[PDB]
């Protein structure tokens, strides 16, 4: 998949030239955010399970039909509910990868070139996952630079599902 | 193109796990090596053509026939000599990329894949290039961890060409 480093080398290789100082300065300056993105990667790995399970609960309360209705796409069973926390934990895992990379690549390949394609042959609602992500955005308790990265990718995923 | 960061994420994404404490430690301690990777890239971007000029001349001297022989693969004309400089510059350009990334990726794609399978049809000798590569190694004037990264990758190119 793509990262801004893989993109910058790919572009400079296509025109057969070295990376100029200005292209090389945008690699020097993204090491401030990538240091912050490594604390966010270590924060997501620490509380991800509990955040995902707490996020699942909010969705169940916000959309009570999901826990009582039919059964193919609905969390009517305790097995279906387990699958919801796993689906949510997966977003949190992909968002952590984006923070380590300093780009949207991991999400671009999971949601845009992934989820938005086959959900026509599944029928789950994006709103269930936007609410889950809004809950983890407003309840993670992260600092400043660390919060910056986590909130950039959580918000990119929310909008990718739009 | 493979980078050690894109293989790290790719690997954990197949297990459906967050990057562990120690997988993140192999990314953290790379900031000293990646800083040396960007200075080495700057050095190649600055003197590259001059080194490719001095390397080409050393080749015409070790192998005097490449200057006075046949015609298809030889630098027997000033148009042929200019191509030799260009092929050497390409190596130095691909080496500069590996330095920035912190992995052999750019070289694997250029030397192993492509060059070694298509040269069977072109007939050029890997020897002339190993000899131009050893000359930029022996007298680039670089020192410290910058010479380390540069020599790691210059030695990877020489290796792959065998
Ligand atoms: C969790 C928000 C949730 C609620 C509240 C609910 O009623 N159902 C649901 C849990 C659930 N998920 C599946 C199956 C899948 N979910 C997937 C992931 C998606 N994430 C999205 O944002 C989205 C819409 C764009 C998805 C489709 C996927 C890919 C699957 C199927 C493939 C798989 O992972 O196995 C189910 C039902 C099927 C099952 O239990 O496996 C439920 C109940
Ligand atoms: C420079 C070392 C040199 C000397 C001293 C010489 O006599 N010939 C040669 C310069 C030269 N190169 C080409 C054409 C190509 N060079 C390519 C790159 C390679 N890098 C290698 O390490 C290697 C061996 C494994 C190569 C073959 C390639 C891919 C080509 C062909 C395609 C292209 O880029 O044009 C020529 C021939 C002139 C021509 O343009 O075909 C010479 C003379």
From Swiss-Prot, chains A, B:
Pfam families: Phycobilisome (PF00502). Contains one covalently linked bilin chromophore. The keyword Transport applies. Keywords: Antenna complex, Bile pigment, Chromophore, Electron transport, Membrane, Photosynthesis, Phycobilisome, Thylakoid, Transport. GO terms for biological process: photosynthesis. One of its GO terms (cellular component) is phycobilisome. Gene3D superfamilies: Phycocyanins. InterPro entries: Globin-like_sf, Phycobilisome_asu/bsu, Phycobilisome_asu/bsu_sf. (15Z)-phycoviolobilin binds at residue 84. Its main location: membrane. It is a peripheral membrane protein. It is found in: Cellular thylakoid membrane. Light-harvesting photosynthetic bile pigment-protein from the phycobiliprotein complex. Heterodimer of an alpha and a beta chain. Belongs to the phycobiliprotein family. This is Phycoerythrocyanin alpha chain. It comes from Mastigocladus laminosus. The gene is pccA.
